[PDB]
Amino acid sequence: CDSNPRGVSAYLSRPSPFDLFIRKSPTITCLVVDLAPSKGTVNLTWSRASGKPVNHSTRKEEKQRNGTLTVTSTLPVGTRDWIEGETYQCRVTHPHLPRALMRSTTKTSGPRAAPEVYAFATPEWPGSRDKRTLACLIQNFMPEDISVQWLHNEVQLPDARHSTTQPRKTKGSGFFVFSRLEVTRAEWEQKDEFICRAVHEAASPSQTVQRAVSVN
Amino acid sequence: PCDSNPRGVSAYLSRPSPFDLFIRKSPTITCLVVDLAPSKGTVNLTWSRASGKPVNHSTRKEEKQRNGTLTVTSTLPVGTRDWIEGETYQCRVTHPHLPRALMRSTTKTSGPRAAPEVYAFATPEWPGSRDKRTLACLIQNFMPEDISVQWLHNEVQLPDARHSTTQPRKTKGSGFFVFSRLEVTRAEWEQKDEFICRAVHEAASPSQTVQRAVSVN
Amino acid sequence: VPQKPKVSLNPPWNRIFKGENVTLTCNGNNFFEVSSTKWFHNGSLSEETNSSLNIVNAKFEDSGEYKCQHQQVAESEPVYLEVFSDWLLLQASAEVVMEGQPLFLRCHGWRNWDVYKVIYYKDGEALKYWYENHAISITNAAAEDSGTYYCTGKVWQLDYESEPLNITVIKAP
Ligand SMILES: *[C@@H]1O[C@H](CO)[C@@H](O[C@@H]2O[C@H](CO)[C@@H](O[C@@H]3O[C@H](CO[C@H]4O[C@H](CO)[C@@H](O)[C@H](O)[C@@H]4O[C@H]4O[C@H](CO)[C@@H](O)[C@H](O)[C@@H]4O)[C@@H](O)[C@H](O[C@H]4O[C@H](CO)[C@@H](O)[C@H](O)[C@@H]4O)[C@@H]3O)[C@H](O)[C@H]2NC(C)=O)[C@H](O)[C@H]1NC(C)=O
Ligand SMILES: *[C@@H]1O[C@H](CO)[C@@H](O[C@@H]2O[C@H](CO)[C@@H](O[C@@H]3O[C@H](CO[C@H]4O[C@H](CO)[C@@H](O)[C@H](O)[C@@H]4O)[C@@H](O)[C@H](O[C@H]4O[C@H](CO)[C@@H](O)[C@H](O)[C@@H]4O)[C@@H]3O)[C@H](O)[C@H]2NC(C)=O)[C@H](O)[C@H]1NC(C)=O
Ligand SMILES: *[C@@H]1O[C@H](CO[C@@H]2O[C@@H](C)[C@@H](O)[C@@H](O)[C@@H]2O)[C@@H](O[C@@H]2O[C@H](CO)[C@@H](O[C@@H]3O[C@H](CO)[C@@H](O)[C@H](O)[C@@H]3O)[C@H](O)[C@H]2NC(C)=O)[C@H](O)[C@H]1NC(C)=O
Numbered sequence: 131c132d133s134n135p136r137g138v139s140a141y142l143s144r145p146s147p148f149d150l151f152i153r154k155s156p157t158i159t160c161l162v163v164d165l166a167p168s169k170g171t172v173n174l175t176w177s178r179a180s181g182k183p184v185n186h187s188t189r190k191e192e193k194q195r196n197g198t199l200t201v202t203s204t205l206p207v208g209t210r211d212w213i214e215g216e217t218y219q220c221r222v223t224h225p226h227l228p229r230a231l232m233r234s235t236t237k238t239s240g241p242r243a244a245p246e247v248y249a250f251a252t253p254e255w256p257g258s259r260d261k262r263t264l265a266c267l268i269q270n271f272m273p274e275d276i277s278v279q280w281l282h283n284e285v286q287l288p289d290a291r292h293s294t295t296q297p298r299k300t301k302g303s304g305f306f307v308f309s310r311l312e313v314t315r316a317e318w319e320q321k322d323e324f325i326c327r328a329v330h331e332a333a334s335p336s337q338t339v340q341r342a343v344s345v346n
Numbered sequence: 347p348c349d350s351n352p353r354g355v356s357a358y359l360s361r362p363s364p365f366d367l368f369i370r371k372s373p374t375i376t377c378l379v380v381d382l383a384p385s386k387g388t389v390n391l392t393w394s395r396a397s398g399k400p401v402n403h404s405t406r407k408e409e410k411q412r413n414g415t416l417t418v419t420s421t422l423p424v425g426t427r428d429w430i431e432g433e434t435y436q437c438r439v440t441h442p443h444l445p446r447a448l449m450r451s452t453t454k455t456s457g458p459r460a461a462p463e464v465y466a467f468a469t470p471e472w473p474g475s476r477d478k479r480t481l482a483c484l485i486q487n488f489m490p491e492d493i494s495v496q497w498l499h500n501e502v503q504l505p506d507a508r509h510s511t512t513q514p515r516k517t518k519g520s521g522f523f524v525f526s527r528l529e530v531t532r533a534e535w536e537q538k539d540e541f542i543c544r545a546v547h548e549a550a551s552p553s554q555t556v557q558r559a560v561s562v563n
Numbered sequence: 564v565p566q567k568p569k570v571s572l573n574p575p576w577n578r579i580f581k582g583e584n585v586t587l588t589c590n591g592n593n594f595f596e597v598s599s600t601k602w603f604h605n606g607s608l609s610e611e612t613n614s615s616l617n618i619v620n621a622k623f624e625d626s627g628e629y630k631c632q633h634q635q636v637a638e639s640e641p642v643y644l645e646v647f648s649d650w651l652l653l654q655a656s657a658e659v660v661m662e663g664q665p666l667f668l669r670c671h672g673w674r675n676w677d678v679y680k681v682i683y684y685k686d687g688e689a690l691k692y693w694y695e696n697h698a699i700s701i702t703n704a705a706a707e708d709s710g711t712y713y714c715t716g717k718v719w720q721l722d723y724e725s726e727p728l729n730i731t732v733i734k735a736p
């Protein structure tokens with residue numbers, strides 16, 4: 131809370147569906163937090179379980195506002211190797227620590243069930259006559275690793291445009307996520323076709339899945 | 347500002363839910379103390395108002411937890427009026443094992459009060475099943491963030507465990523938005539089509555309620 | 564058939580973090596010291612001949628089997644010393660405790676760092692929790708007191724668990 135110091139924590143993000151199937155250039159990221167100005171290095175080391183060598187990594191050390199110090203390292207990963215269950219590990223070491231810090235990650239397991247998506251659209255409201263809200267529900271899928279997004283006249287909208295929630299389980303052993311994309315009049319007059327795409331490890335045939343929508 | 351976790355013992359004080367406050371019209375706040383250690387004597391929990399006005403009798407349970415710790419919860423009945431009018435309640439826990447006393451307080455959330463906008467929807471069948479259809483209800487542009495969602499069906503307030511409601515999230519319109527999902531069975535829509543997704547907020551008039559009907563076909 | 568020589572540890576803990584200190588002493592059944600002592604590490608004869616053998620800034624190399632013998636044939640029952648490097652280490656006064664004798668458990672935090680909310684587990688059950696670190700002092704051993712133990716605690720706000728430890732207790736008809 132105040133004086134009591136907090137110790138180093140490490141996290142390791144998994145490749146997004148998108149960065150993995152569309153962009154076809156997946157990368158995992160190891161993020162270390164709560165580090166503090168040390169006189170020694172802070173070795174970060176990437177390794178595969180198969181023993182096979184690894185590409186060169188990235189690395190940034192941002193002194194944060196709260197006196198702490200962060201370290202992130204992103205690593206390029208073979209699209210094939212990953213889907214075939216490979217396993218990667220991040221090993222950070224700090225001079226003043228007992229055991230080393232490690233974290234690993236690989237392709238999520240289980241049965242692969244494709245996504246079901248349904249797009250909707252709000253009716254006007256006395257508050258404003260030129261602003262209408264969109265919503266897109268994607269359910270009954272698994273694993274939980276999903277990449278949602280939107281299209282509009284062949285234009286993949288800005289990620290910061292929509293709000294997508296975090297996966298949640300259902301009484302059907304599958305997950306469900308919600309997306310919300312506020313819209314401007316100007317845009318639907320430009321065209322009505324609004325697409326809410328979805329990228330999952332399942333869905334065929336291009337690992338993509340979309341459902342059109344529109345007002346009126 | 348951290349003289350709030352005596353000997354490590356933390357406490358939480360929950361605020362009355364919209365629902366328990368407007369529908370049920372019998373609101374209650376709860377003080378939960380955690381990480382206490384077993385001892386000869388019990389704690390000395392004490393409720394008090396900032397106005398100085400007396401307080402109703404409280405409840406109290408002490409559950410020895412699995413991890414060797416010991417918990418204490420105390421719920422307190424609260425005058426529906428007093429609360430909305432900004433009153434302020436405080437929970438004061440005190441035990442020998444403790445150096446400083448532990449306190450926490452709470453009152454009506456502040457700021458501008460903007461009512462909820464709700465829109466109910468409904469999914470089309472899918473080759474997977476022809477007798478199971480999904481409902482969704484979006485409630486947005488409201489504030490404070492304290493909201494109680496629920497559903498009705500033929501004058502029957504469905505079981506809370508039936509639907510999944512998310513946590514509030516901000517919007518580029520200074521208001522919040524929450525989503526709700528309620529899977530449904532064929533049998534039920536043949537019984538009737540009218541499905542209601544009510545909402546309870548401190549704003550909305552005139553009964554502090556707000557609903558939008560829905561139905562398949 | 565005579566009394567064999569015993570080895571005592573001070574502090575008791577026969578498992579310690581690297582860089583820690585410990586001392587081995589050979590029996591009081593040789594009081595005025597009538598015979599030089601001979602210490603054995605994993606086998607070789609140590610060059611210390613005195614009644615107590617020290618260990619400083621204990622390196623891992625120092626782990627192992629220790630035995631001392633006097634001028635007879637029999638040699639002390641061996642004493643195993645393990646040197647660790649983790650966040651929490653559960654130390655015990657003795658891994659095998661004869662019925663009735665005392666027992667001591669201690670959740671020891673690395674570099675003697677503070678550990679709050681220490682909980683000791685016994686066969687998957689929560690034996691004792693305390694806001695702060697504390698030693699488990701079992702005055703008179705018993706049968707229920709056997710089983711595997713281990714501790715957990717927070718160090719610098721994070722959570723840690725000691726590798727598990729087995730403790731056994733005997734009986735004499
Ligand atoms: C030994 O075991 C103990 C339990 O066996 C354990 O105690 C637990 O400590 C944690 C914190 O250390 C406590 O968390 C707090 O929980 C409060 C409320 O509990 C839940 O129920 C309330 C209603 O009864 C809800 O209002 C809460 O949302 C919460 O419910 C969650 O889970 C349900 C189930 O899926 C879900 O529907 C809800 O949406 C919730 O997710 C909360 O009010 C506290 O909130 C605070 O912290 C959060 C995040 O940290 C903040 O976002 C909030 O703003 C707020 O500051 C907090 O979560 C937990 O209640 C204790 N368990 C018990 C007894 O219920 C103890 O830590 C263990 N000790 C050791 C040393 O091992
Ligand atoms: C009497 O007999 C005992 C046992 O046969 C001997 O003691 C052994 O001594 C070696 C050192 O020579 C000890 O090995 C060391 O263990 C350390 C701790 O291991 C932990 O951490 C690692 C890494 O996270 C985990 O994989 C492991 O599970 C444990 O949690 C390591 O840190 C040491 O590593 C360094 O040295 C080794 C070997 O030199 C290298 O491979 C590494 O790259 C690194 O540089 C090391 O492995 C061993 O544990 C001891 N055994 C026991 C039972 O304690 C005595 O030496 C012997 N007496 C003599 C002197 O003859
Ligand atoms: C395990 O025991 C060792 C050694 O024990 C101590 O030092 C010996 C030389 C004897 O004098 C013993 O009687 C004494 O107990 C401990 O290591 C020692 O640690 C101290 C500090 O804790 C060191 O002192 C420092 O020395 C440096 C340089 O010499 C100075 O700059 C410092 O100002 C300070 O005086 C001491 O040198 C060191 N001993 C050596 C030479 O290795 C060890 O700490 C202990 N383990 C623990 C922590 O329990």
Ligand SMILES: C[C@H](CCC(=O)NCCC[N+](C)(C)CCCS(=O)(=O)[O-])[C@H]1CC[C@H]2[C@@H]3[C@H](O)C[C@@H]4C[C@H](O)CC[C@]4(C)[C@H]3C[C@H](O)[C@]12C
Pocket residue numbers: 133134135353354679680717718719720
């Ligand atoms: C924490 C202890 C005192 C014990 C204490 O106050 N005990 C009761 C209250 C709360 N706890 C700590 C138990 C909560 C743990 C949370 S837990 O979630 O783990 O339960 C105090 C005593 C002296 C303090 C150090 C020195 O000043 C030097 C230096 C100043 C920097 O500016 C920050 C770093 C550093 C090393 C300081 C750290 C820590 O500050 C110390 C060890």
Ligand SMILES: *[C@@H]1O[C@H](CO)[C@@H](O[C@@H]2O[C@H](CO)[C@@H](O[C@@H]3O[C@H](CO)[C@@H](O)[C@H](O)[C@@H]3O)[C@H](O)[C@H]2NC(C)=O)[C@H](O)[C@H]1NC(C)=O
Pocket residue numbers: 136141143161163164194195196198200
């Ligand atoms: C000092 O400030 C930094 C930066 O605000 C704090 O770091 C933040 O630490 C949290 C966890 O405590 C990180 O959250 C985690 O992010 C990962 C990455 O997506 C996610 O997978 C986890 O589920 C979780 O959300 C947070 O990202 C991180 N901030 C940064 C740099 O992105 C740090 O904790 C602060 N120090 C103190 C006082 O704790």
Ligand SMILES: *[C@@H]1O[C@H](CO[C@@H]2O[C@@H](C)[C@@H](O)[C@@H](O)[C@@H]2O)[C@@H](O[C@@H]2O[C@H](CO)[C@@H](O)[C@H](O)[C@H]2NC(C)=O)[C@H](O)[C@H]1NC(C)=O
Pocket residue numbers: 709710711728729
């Ligand atoms: C640490 O102790 C466990 C548990 O020991 C058991 O309970 C004791 C009270 C005593 O009755 C023992 O004889 C019991 O075995 C040991 O767990 C065993 O581990 C071995 C692997 O070596 C495995 O084959 C057995 O199935 C395990 N027994 C059970 C039922 O858990 C463990 O081996 C001990 N540590 C060691 C020396 O490895």
